[PDB]
Write a protein that binds this DNA or RNA. Structure first.
Lengths: 122, 141, 185
RNA sequence: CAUGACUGGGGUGAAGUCG
RNA sequence: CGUCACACCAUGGGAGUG
RNA sequence: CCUAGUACGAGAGGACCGG
RNA sequence: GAACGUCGUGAGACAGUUC
RNA sequence: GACUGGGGCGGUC
RNA sequence: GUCGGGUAAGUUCCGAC
RNA sequence: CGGCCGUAACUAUAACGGUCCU
RNA sequence: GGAUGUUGGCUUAGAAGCAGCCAUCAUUUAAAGAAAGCGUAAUAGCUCAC
C-alpha cells in the first residue's frame, strides 16, 4: 500500500555479472598456467581443452580454448574474452583466437572472423 | 746416397692428383707449386703405368721450384694386387688374408729391382717375402 | 630377533629409505645440454665427411648454453646445418667463433620453488631414517625384555643403532647438497 | 591497500570412495 | 544428499610483514 | 694496486717472481 | 624444594624432561 | 650370608 | 624438533604446528 | 576406552577393505 | 758410418723406428734394431744400439 511503500519502497536487485575478469572490459590479458583436457558433464562426453590464466589483474581463472586445433603453451600469453561454457564448469571464459602470443585454428575456411584465419590461399 | 736436401716424399695414384687432402697442403706447405706438379706428375705416370699407386720423391729448391723421381710401386701394394686383395691382414701371420706363388714374388722382385739393393734375384725375392710376411700374405712354393 | 638381526634389519631399512631419497633427488632437467650429443654428426669439411670430434670441440660452461668451437671456419658452417632440424630440433646461433646453442632456461623464481622441494625430499629421507632409529629403539626395547638383555647391553646396542643412523643422515646430507649445486648450476 | 606459515567455509570441475 | 580423497578458482580468519 | 690485463688462453678468465 | 614420563610393593631412582 | 680384581647387578656356593 | 619472524649471522626470544 | 596388514591419478597420506582381541 | 724393400701390416684425421695392437723378416755389408730416448700434427731433425 502507498503507506507501506512510503516507508519501505520497492527494492532493486544488484545484478550479479558472472565474470571475475570484470573491470568492465571486452577482454583481458593472461599468461596461461597450464593446458588441461578436462572431461565434460554427464550429458556429453569427449575431452575438451582448457587452461588456467593468470589475468593481468592477478585474478586467476581457466579459459576455454575453442577451435579444431589447440596450440598454446604453459607460458604463452593469451587473451580472455568471455562467454562461459556448460559442459565445463568454472570455465566461464574463452581465449581469443588469433591474438597475443597465442595461435589460431588452421585450415578453417568457414567463419574466419571467429577463430584464427584471415583470407585463405585464395 | 748424396747430400740431403729439403724434399717431401709421398705415394700418389698413377693418373690423378691435386686434391687438397691427399696432396695440396702436404707439399703445399713446402712452397711447392701443386698445379705444376699435378700436371707434371700425371704426365709421365700415364706412360710408366696407370692404375698403380707410385711413390714419388719431390725435391723443392730455394727457388721453391722442384723436381721429382718416379720409382716403382711399394712392395705392399704390388703384393696386394698380386694377392688380389684390397687390404693387409690386420693381424699378420695370425690370419692369412691371401697368398702369392713364389713365381709372383720373383715378378715383384723384378719390378722393384731398380729400387732394390739386392745383389741377386734370389736376394730381392727374399726382401719381397719380408713385406708379405708383414701383410698376412703367405707364399706357396 | 637378536641384536645382530636388529642391526642388520635397521641398516637395511635405513639404506632403503636412503634409496627412496636418492630416487626423489636424482632426476634433473639437464638432458639436452650434453656435449657428447653432437659428436656423431658428420661435418662437411673440405667436401669430406670428418666426424665432429675430429674437427671441433663441444664444451658446456653451464647447462643453459652450449658452445661449439670448430677448428676450421668452413666446418663450423656445416655443423650449424645439422644442430637444428635433424631429430634434435634445437636452435644454434652463429655468435663468435663458436655456435651458441640455447637449451631451455629456468627463472630464479622457479629456482626457489625447486630448492625447497629438494629440502622436502631430503626431509622425507631423514624422517624415515630417524623413524627407523626410533622403531629400532622400540624393537630393541622388546628385544631387551624378550632376550633378557642387560641395561649396558641395551646401551651398547643403542650406540650401535645410533652409529648406523648417523651414517645415513650423513649420506642424506651429501645427496641433497650435491643436487642443490647441480640445480644451481 | 598490498602481503603471510597455517587455517575455515564456498565454487567449479572429473566424477572416485562411503553410505 | 553429505563427508572424505584429489586438481584448479575466488574468498574469510592469521604470529605478523610493507 | 703496480708488475700485467702481460705469460698462459679459443674464448671465459688470468698468474709466477718481486714490490 | 617441587612435578611429569618411566622404574620400583616402597624408601627412592634416571648417562630423561620441567619451574 | 659369603665369594667377588672396591662394592653392587649378574653368577657361584 | 619443524615452519614463520627478528638478525649479515639468533642452541635464547616471539608466533605456529 | 586396542593392535597387525593390503589399498585411488607423481609420489607421500588412505576415506576403503581384511584380520586378531575386547 | 748407422743404408735398401719400407712411410712394414692394422689402426687413425695423421701413426713414416719412437700413441696403440701384430709381426720383427729379408737384402747391402766393415756395420746398419722394421729401432733406445728426445722431438713433429704427421714428416723432418737430434742422440742410441752396432
Amino acid at each position: 500500500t502507498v503507506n507501506q511503500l512510503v516507508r519501505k519502497p520497492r527494492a532493486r536487485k544488484v545484478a550479479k555479472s558472472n565474470v571475475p575478469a570484470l573491470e568492465a572490459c571486452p577482454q583481458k590479458r593472461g599468461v596461461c598456467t597450464r593446458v588441461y583436457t578436462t572431461t565434460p558433464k554427464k550429458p556429453n562426453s569427449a575431452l575438451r581443452k582448457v587452461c588456467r590464466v593468470r589475468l593481468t589483474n592477478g585474478f586467476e581463472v581457466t579459459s576455454y580454448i575453442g577451435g579444431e586445433g589447440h596450440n598454446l603453451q604453459e607460458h604463452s600469453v593469451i587473451l580472455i574474452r568471455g562467454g562461459r561454457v556448460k559442459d565445463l564448469p568454472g570455465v566461464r571464459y574463452h581465449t581469443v583466437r588469433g591474438a597475443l602470443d597465442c595461435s589460431g585454428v588452421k585450415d578453417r575456411k568457414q567463419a574466419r572472423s571467429k577463430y584464427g584465419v584471415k583470407r585463405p590461399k585464395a | 746416397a748424396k747430400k740431403v736436401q729439403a724434399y717431401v716424399k709421398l705415394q700418389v695414384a698413377a693418373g690423378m692428383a691435386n686434391p687438397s687432402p691427399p696432396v695440396g697442403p702436404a707439399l703445399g706447405q713446402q712452397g711447392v707449386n701443386i698445379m705444376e706438379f699435378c700436371k707434371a706428375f700425371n704426365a709421365k705416370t700415364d706412360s710408366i703405368e696407370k692404375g698403380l699407386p707410385i711413390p714419388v720423391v719431390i725435391t723443392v729448391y730455394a727457388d721453391r721450384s722442384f723436381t721429382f723421381v718416379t720409382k716403382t710401386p711399394p712392395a705392399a701394394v704390388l703384393l696386394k694386387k698380386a694377392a688380389g686383395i684390397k687390404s693387409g691382414s690386420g693381424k699378420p701371420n695370425k690370419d692369412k688374408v691371401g697368398k702369392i706363388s713364389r713365381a709372383q714374388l720373383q715378378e715383384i722382385a723384378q719390378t722393384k729391382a731398380a729400387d732394390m739393393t739386392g745383389a741377386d734375384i734370389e736376394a730381392m725375392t727374399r726382401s719381397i717375402e719380408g713385406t708379405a710376411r708383414s701383410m698376412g700374405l703367405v707364399v706357396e712354393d | 630377533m637378536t641384536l645382530k638381526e636388529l642391526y642388520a634389519e635397521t641398516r637395511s631399512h635405513m639404506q632403503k629409505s636412503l634409496e627412496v631419497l636418492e630416487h626423489n633427488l636424482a632426476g634433473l632437467r639437464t638432458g639436452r645440454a650434453n656435449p657428447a650429443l653432437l659428436l656423431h654428426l658428420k661435418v662437411e669439411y673440405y667436401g669430406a665427411h670428418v666426424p665432429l670430434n675430429q674437427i671441433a670441440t663441444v664444451t658446456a660452461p653451464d647447462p643453459r648454453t652450449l658452445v661449439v668451437q670448430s677448428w676450421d671456419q668452413n666446418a663450423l658452417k656445416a655443423i650449424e646445418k645439422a644442430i637444428r632440424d635433424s631429430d634434435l630440433g634445437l636452435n644454434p646461433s652463429n655468435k663468435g667463433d663458436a655456435l651458441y646453442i640455447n637449451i631451455p632456461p629456468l627463472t630464479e623464481e622457479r629456482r626457489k620453488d625447486l630448492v625447497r622441494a629438494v629440502r622436502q625430499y631430503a626431509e622425507e629421507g631423514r624422517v624415515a631414517i630417524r623413524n627407523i632409529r626410533r622403531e629400532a629403539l622400540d624393537k630393541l626395547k622388546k628385544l631387551a625384555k624378550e632376550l633378557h638383555l642387560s641395561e649396558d647391553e641395551t646401551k651398547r646396542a643403542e650406540a650401535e643403532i645410533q652409529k648406523i643412523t648417523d651414517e645415513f643422515i650423513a649420506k642424506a646430507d651429501q645427496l641433497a647438497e650435491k643436487k642443490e649445486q647441480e640445480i644451481l648450476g
